[model samples]
Target: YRYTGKLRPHYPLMPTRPVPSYIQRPDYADHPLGMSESEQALKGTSQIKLLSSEDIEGMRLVCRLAREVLDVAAGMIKPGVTTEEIDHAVHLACIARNCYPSPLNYYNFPKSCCTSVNEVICHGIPDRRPLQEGDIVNVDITLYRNGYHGDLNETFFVGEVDDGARKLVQTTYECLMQAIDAVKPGVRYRELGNIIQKHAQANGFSVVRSYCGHGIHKLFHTAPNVPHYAKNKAVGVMKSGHVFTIEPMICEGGWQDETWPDGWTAVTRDGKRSAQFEHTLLVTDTGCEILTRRLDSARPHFMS
Candidate 1:
């Protein structure tokens, strides 16, 4: 396959790790092709699940677990560390908590989590490439526990990244934070793109349109598609009890993206950098709660 940027997919991904028989598994966990039949059946429907208080409690537990797993992966970021190693750590962290790594085998994803580096926008498979100095990587983590999923991701500096990279990552984080701030009831779901796009453009960055945030709970990806670019036609409106993610993929160059031949990695078309941040949120009567809120022990220290 033709390469689009300096980053290349390291082939021969390690075989999928094992999960204990006692652990509860998603429907796709044992599928021959890792097919998610549940996700497929819900496709094309605009139905959004409004969580009851019991469901909210379930989400709270899983999101906290997801946050812990993400922190474990983020703490391992530095020069000379391979994303594959990070994936291994994430896998172990999830199992230790008696939670299932949601990304493992969902639609045939081979790794426990996504490790997108440099120009990679999202869904970059973990591989043998060692993260180098001045590089930035996004560690996306989702954990399934008690029949609910908690999804969140954050980009981190590998070592001493340049000012451009730092600003892009910080801006991406701010984009997500600002979007989350607007998650009160009656706010149009599509309105988030305006806030996100405005901030990214003001900082001289572009938002990737192909990948939008979605409603996440029992299903990994679902309705009320949340686009990150401006003037998009995404449907739905925010309401209390609505739980979803607002991850924005901001690029240092053009907004266009291309998928690697491996059919998972998505990279910037212009070979420039991209950064992203995500949080699963629940709308309250007044505002929203960040289910995957980072704890004091969270690493990389940039967001503090």
Candidate 2:
């Protein structure tokens, strides 16, 4: 109760889990060489890339793998499992499909996946803490396969939760889906934040402003940085074949966030719960395609 967010982050950080040696890591995983030469060349532009039919197909394959791996990790959420074990599960899942865990050492990120819990907006580092009943967690996963990347995440209830907690998760997801529906050819990227912020604010939640979605195709992150707040200055327009994520982090209290001393955890300033959901989308002539959608049988009970 004494903490800034009234949330005591449990730590004593678990040893960083390792992927099997046989699994192929991304270019930046083993070495600290940051963005590739090709990714670096586009430093000043917000120009969206229009994918060829083959490129879109490649992303679809990677997105499929991401969904399958995310399902396996979600199944591990229970009262006693450590987040570190969940990280191992995701790492192994990626290897099983021959996909590289995109977050592994990307810019020196130690873990293979992010395990953000209550109040943590995003990029929460996995640790030794065992999740308890009523905890809400967002597992952000990315996979690089066949020279492309797939990104997506969902907030999950650890067990039975109070009405307030349940509502926050539900609304956060709705914010994401509604924002995705607004994507199509010719829509400006700046408008995405308006749609997202509207739904979130209407539901008594605030949108996090610090982190944002980005154009993800061949590289892990690229141009057309997508913000999820209203009146942002992000430029560019959706074009058929452009791919990006529209993940919004929603908080029950304040929209502002503070990072932990460790530098990865971003928690809400008011100690209220935070939830997030993400999906990589491909713009089409009429609408957008959800690249990392859940299987029909796996829809959330509340969403159903």
Candidate 3:
């Protein structure tokens, strides 16, 4: 049985694949009224804020734990494995680590982690439905430990996946890495957006802007709202000691997205397929470090 707490019946299917219509798109060209191109000439923000050194260490530890839990979850992905079973594996992994599953009950979220399947976009609550062959599922994990938090997720092919889904997930993963590669002590957070958006566009994919990476420490959302697409109003310059994520939600058709009736799951407004890859990054004096780097034994990028 699916343990959705009190959520409603929802299926992560793109019954209308590629939204029948796309919204007018967000109107933030050249920033809003009185806002600078950087959106900071008014917000009075200069650089991305870094958590305390002590907290940074805590964040790194939590991220490591999250990665381990994610590895366990990934290992359990195959035919006949229910999404609910995956959730239970995740919950058990977190508890064994002596950490709390941040997503559980956060805003009353029903599951310990988000299990997005196929056109589900993101936030597909774990359920009893058995994953079938050719299905691509995304497992988003967030763990709270000590005094900080860690967030990361990735899309995986269930057994054998179609070429379309494979390309989408592969490209999205590269975009996340490419965006992270651009992260440095002096790079602007907006640069992360440019690389992510540009790559997705080059590959004929649309980047979702409704959501972006955020500062994950004790507080779930904080300064330095990391936008994945290009030319965003994301403030703060990357600096040593700074730590955050570059999780760009990439879609297949249009960039616009809409929230599910449940209000927590965001789907491609165009009913297009979507894929995402997330990683917690730490800015060092010279470059950045991927704290949630995938395990050496995890599934290769996109094995067919």
RMSD of each: 1.3, 2.1, 10.7
Question: Tens-digit lDDT track for model 2 on 1-304?
Answer: 2356645556675665666676665567666643455667787887878899999999999998999888888889888898888998998899899998999877677788999989889988888888989899889999989888999998888888899988999898888888888888889999989999999989989999999989998888898899999999998988988999988999998898888876577888887889999999999888998889876665653354
- Which candidate number would show the highest lDDT if scored against the true structure? 1
lDDT (Cα atoms) of all candidates against the true structure: 0.91, 0.86, 0.75
Q: Residue 71 error for model 3, in Å?
A: 0.4
TM-scores for candidates 1 onward, in order: 0.97, 0.93, 0.82
Off by over 4 Å in 1: 297-300
Q: Which should have the higher TM-score, number 1 or number 3?
A: 1
Top TM-score hit: 1
Model 3's C-alpha root-mean-square deviation from the true structure amounts to 10.7
Looking at candidate 1, what is the lDDT of residue 201?
Answer: 98
Judge candidate 2 against the unseen true structure and give its global Cα lDDT, from 0 to 1. 0.86
Report residue 84 deviation for candidate 2 (angstroms).
Answer: 0.9
Off by over 4 Å in 3: 1-48, 295-304
Look at candidate 2 and give me any clashing residue pairs.
Answer: 5-271
Superior by lDDT: candidate 1 or candidate 2 = 1
**Model 3 residue 200 CA deviation in Å:** 0.9
